[PDB]
Amino acid sequence: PPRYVIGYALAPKKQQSFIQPSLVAQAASRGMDLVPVDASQPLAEQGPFHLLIHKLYGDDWRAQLVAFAARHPAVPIVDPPHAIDRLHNRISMLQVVSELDHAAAQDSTFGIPSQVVVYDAAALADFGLLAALRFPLIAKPLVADGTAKSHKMSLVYHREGLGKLRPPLVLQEAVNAGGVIFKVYVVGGHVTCVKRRSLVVPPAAFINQIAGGLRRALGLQLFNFDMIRDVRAGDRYLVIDINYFPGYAKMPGYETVLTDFFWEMVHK
């Protein structure tokens, strides 16, 4: 029976969290060898791979990945750098949601929250529209990715606290949220979901339809989304983040899901 190299290109802190003995063992036992990509050596120079997974950001890496991709058409990349680029900018991140409008009328509806972009300290002070905003506000830096430390979301109650943030940033209103957040982890066509008190769980078929959509639209095997209930109508949900290749190490039995996923991908 043949054997399958899974190359992996991840920042140290991600490797420490993601690549765990339990993942490495389970994969090995099923015939798949997780193998670190040398960061000090062209990806093209490096050994044959049956699958490449990565979560690195650079014009350098983009370049090597495209050389590889154009040299090795048959080898899956998880995920293709094009598709990852769309979620880097917080306001261009929800662009792709709107895309599967033709989802389900059922007894649940899903939408994207309207957002406000402030590029300079000047506008933070002078922009009239900021004064007609309801607090608290969810504030995210406009171009995240998950590199630079402060590229996670935060909560602004005082309008003072808003003028202490560093632009460029995106804002959305948190007032119809009920104060709850549901983090949904997606691996290919699998869905796993976790509750988290911010600052009455959605139907499983709805969460599955949306993940189904996001996956189609995003062209991404590895993401999560945050949604909230619109507490006005009782039965409506909003997609508020989409973070690529999230911390699966945090959901339990991820080893099994991800090995099951690696397996699917190397018989593709």
Known binding residues for 1D-myo-inositol 6-phosphate: 13, 55, 146, 151, 183, 185, 224, 243, 247, 250
Q: Distance between CA 205 and CA 95 in Å, rounded?
A: 23
Q: How far is CA 228 from the centre of its chain?
A: 16
Q: Residue 95's binding partner, choosing from a copy of itself, Cl ion, none, with beta-carbon cut-off 5 to 8 A by kind?
A: a copy of itself
47 and 5 Cβ atoms separated by less than 8 Å: yes
Please identify, using beta-carbon distances, which residue of 32 and 96 lies nearer to a copy of itself.
Answer: 96
Q: Distance between CA 71 and CA 226 in Å, rounded?
A: 37
Q: Min. distance of Cβ 220 from Cl ion in angstroms?
A: 16
Cis peptide before 141 (omega within 30 of 0): no
Known binding positions: 13, 55, 90, 140, 146, 151, 172, 175, 183, 185, 198, 224, 226, 240-241, 243, 247, 250
Q: Min. distance of Cβ 60 from a copy of itself in angstroms?
A: 12
Q: Distance between CA 201 and CA 82 in Å, rounded?
A: 33
Of the candidate spans 9-17, 35-43, 66-74, 81-89, the one that interacts with Cl ion by CB under 5 A turns out to be 9-17
Asked if 146 touches Cl ion (CB under 5 A), the answer is no
Bridge partners, 78 (sequence order):
53
Interaction site with a copy of itself (CB under 8 A)? 59, 62, 66-67, 69-71, 82, 85, 89, 91-92, 94-95, 97-98, 111-120, 122-123, 127-134, 142-143, 167-168, 173
Please identify, using beta-carbon distances, which residue of 123 and 249 lies nearer to Cl ion.
Answer: 249
Q: Which residue reads 């991140």 in tokens? A: 93
Give which of 83, 94, 86 is closest to 117, Cα–Cα: 94
**What does R_g of the chain's alpha carbons equal in angstroms?**
20
List interacting residues with Cl ion (CB under 5 A): 17-18, 247, 249
